[PDB]
């Protein structure tokens, strides 16, 4: 994970500066981040995309659409890659009030 969180971080810092040049928050401010335990490590990276969006929300200050679960691995230019275990992940979200 410690590598995968980093690549996601760099992609965050890249996406934003490409998108909204005036905003400079994320380039320059320390950011503590929490990832609750529970993924099996081979399936650990699977939550990578959520990090890439979390940092962005902290930039804009705008909440996500509510109860919008999301997963998937990310690589340094945002090409989401397939992740396993769709069965349990879907049924798990179904009991959390998931919409989309």
């Amino acid at each position: 994970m410690k590598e995968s969180a980093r690549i996601a971080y760099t992609f965050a810092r890249a996406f934003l500066m490409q998108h909204a040049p005036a905003n400079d928050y994320l380039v320059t401010s320390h950011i503590h981040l929490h990832v609750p335990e529970g993924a099996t490590p081979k399936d650990g990276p699977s939550a990578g995309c959520t990090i890439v969006t979390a940092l962005l929300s902290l930039a804009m200050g705008r909440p996500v659409r509510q109860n919008l679960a999301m997963t998937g691995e990310v690589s340094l230019t945002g090409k989401i890659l397939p992740v396993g275990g769709i069965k349990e992940k879907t049924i798990a979200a179904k009991r959390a009030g998931v919409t989309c």
Partner: protein, 50 residues
């Protein structure tokens, strides 16, 4: 993707495979056109030390 990838063939333990290699600018480049500091890499990918 035009800026930052080039296919790299590689001889993994089970047959060849067409790895990509991907890089990206990590920060704005021209905060200081005159201040002179080197831009070091951050390599990742569970590298071996070699």
């Amino acid at each position: 993707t035009p800026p930052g990838v080039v296919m790299g063939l590689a001889w993994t333990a089970m047959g060849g495979s067409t790895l990509f290699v991907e890089t990206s600018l990590r920060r704005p480049q021209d905060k200081d056109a005159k201040g002179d500091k080197d831009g070091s890499l951050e390599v990742t990918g569970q590298l071996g030390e070699v």
